[PDB]
Amino acid sequence: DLSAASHRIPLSDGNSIPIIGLGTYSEPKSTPKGACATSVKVAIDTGYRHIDGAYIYQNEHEVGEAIREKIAEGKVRREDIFYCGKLWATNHVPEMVRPTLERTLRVLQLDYVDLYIIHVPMAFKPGDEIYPRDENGKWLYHKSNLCATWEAMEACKDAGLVKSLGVSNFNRRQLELILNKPGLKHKPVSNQVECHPYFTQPKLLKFCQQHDIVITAYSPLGTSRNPIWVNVSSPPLLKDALLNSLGKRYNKTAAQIVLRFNIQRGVVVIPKSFNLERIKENFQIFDFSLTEEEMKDIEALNKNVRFVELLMWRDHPEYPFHDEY
Numbered sequence: 001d002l003s004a005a006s007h008r009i010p011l012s013d014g015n016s017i018p019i020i021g022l023g024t025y026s027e028p029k030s031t032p033k034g035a036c037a038t039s040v041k042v043a044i045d046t047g048y049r050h051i052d053g054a055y056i057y058q059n060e061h062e063v064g065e066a067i068r069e070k071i072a073e074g075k076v077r078r079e080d081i082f083y084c085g086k087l088w089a090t091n092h093v094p095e096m097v098r099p100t101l102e103r104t105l106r107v108l109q110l111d112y113v114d115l116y117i118i119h120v121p122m123a124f125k126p127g128d129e130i131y132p133r134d135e136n137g138k139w140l141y142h143k144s145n146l147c148a149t150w151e152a153m154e155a156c157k158d159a160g161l162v163k164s165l166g167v168s169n170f171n172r173r174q175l176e177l178i179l180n181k182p183g184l185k186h187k188p189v190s191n192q193v194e195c196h197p198y199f200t201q202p203k204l205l206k207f208c209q210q211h212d213i214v215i216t217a218y219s220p221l222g223t224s225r226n227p228i229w230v231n232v233s234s235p236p237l238l239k240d241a242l243l244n245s246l247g248k249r250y251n252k253t254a255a256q257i258v259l260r261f262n263i264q265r266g267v268v269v270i271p272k273s274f275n276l277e278r279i280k281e282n283f284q285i286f287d288f289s290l291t292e293e294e295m296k297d298i299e300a301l302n303k304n305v306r307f308v309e310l311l312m313w314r315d316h317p318e319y320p321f322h323d324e325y
């Protein structure tokens with residue numbers, strides 16, 4: 001089934017998604033200009049056909065640049081590349097959804113995105129600020145209306161600006177909001193959430209699977225562990241003894257074991273690397289497979305704890321992480 005040259009899996013709207021892509025979030029402060037563009041190019045040369053991005057990562061112009069260069073030289077056609085962009089919290093107001101997607105299209109200089117997803121279920125104060133809190137540091141929460149925001153998303157697909165629609169960081173209750181929606185035109189095909197062997201998302205995955213929603217594993221290698229936003233209490237994922245042990249068995253790194261685990265069970269992974277060797281390393285996951293014994297054993301590593309808990313927002317009506325799943 002899955003191979004380096006062919007590893008796209010079905011989405012419920014008849015489209016398909018490469019089961020591995022390149023993540024592109026990088027701390028703007030300490031990232032060299034051009035590093036994203038260079039990485040996307042290397043990834044495409046390597047065999048990646050899926051790139052995950054977001055306007056708020058401040059490098060979507062580099063993503064577009066890289067994709068267009070590869071199309072221009074004839075490495076890929078547009079239809080061979082799958083780009084996922086994201087609608088941020090400050091742009092949830094229905095009237096803003098389309099202009100927000102149009103900005104991303106203009107930044108990429110592309111005609112459409114393959115997947116456009118609601119970044120988080122929480123709405124913030126609209127404005128030239130990505131993360132708006134007041135002087136006292138109170139997160140200016142805007143009133144969320146997910147159904148109305150989703151309707152604006154649907155109109156974007158109707159207009160042909162995007163092939164597939166999805167969400168990110170949505171719990172069961174939030175997905176059911178959309179799924180049960182009166183007059184639902186386009187159901188979510190994708191839910192992008194933290195996922196890896198310390199958090200196999202067993203319940204959310206079964207639930208998503210019942211509705212033909214595909215899970216995309218963000219931070220599939222356990223994040224870069226930046227303390228200013230990541231929960232550095234847990235030990236680094238790539239140090240797990242089991243994962244490293246299985247690595248030895250297959251002559252593979254802990255990262256490659258981690259990625260293989262998630263794809264082998266139909267979860268899309270979007271590991272981020274701006275390093276030449278590691279970009280290649282992460283893609284080499286089609287020449288082996290894990291035994292049912294091993295898959296079960298890795299699953300069992302499931303802590304049911306999160307590296308990305310977003311505690312600073314736990315007091316938003318739509319905070320997704322309270323429910324069991």
Ligand SMILES: NC(=O)c1ccc[n+]([C@@H]2O[C@H](COP(=O)([O-])OP(=O)(O)OC[C@H]3O[C@@H](n4cnc5c(N)ncnc54)[C@H](OP(=O)(O)O)[C@@H]3O)[C@@H](O)[C@H]2O)c1
Pocket residue numbers: 022023024025026052053119168169192193217218219220221222223224238253255256270271272273274275278279281282
């Ligand atoms: N929907 C959301 O809310 C959300 C949230 C977070 C992230 N995301 C998306 O998911 C993507 C990936 O998650 P993530 O960036 O947070 O973290 P990640 O992909 O799990 O891991 C990234 C970190 O691991 C390092 N790394 C990559 N490959 C490695 C390897 N083979 N061995 C050892 N280290 C390796 C990278 O450094 P180097 O670059 O130097 O290799 C980077 O520091 C993000 O870039 C973004 O696209 C989405």
Ligand SMILES: C[C@]12CC[C@H]3[C@@H](CCC4=CC(=O)CC[C@@]43C)[C@@H]1CC[C@@H]2O
Pocket residue numbers: 025054131228229
């Ligand atoms: C946590 C943070 C706001 C949320 C950002 C985070 C960088 C990583 C990140 C990636 C996303 O795609 C969702 C939002 C987040 C989680 C930013 C770093 C500083 C700021 O406080």
Ligand SMILES: [Cl-]
Pocket residue numbers: 055056086087088091100
């Ligand atoms: Cl946005």
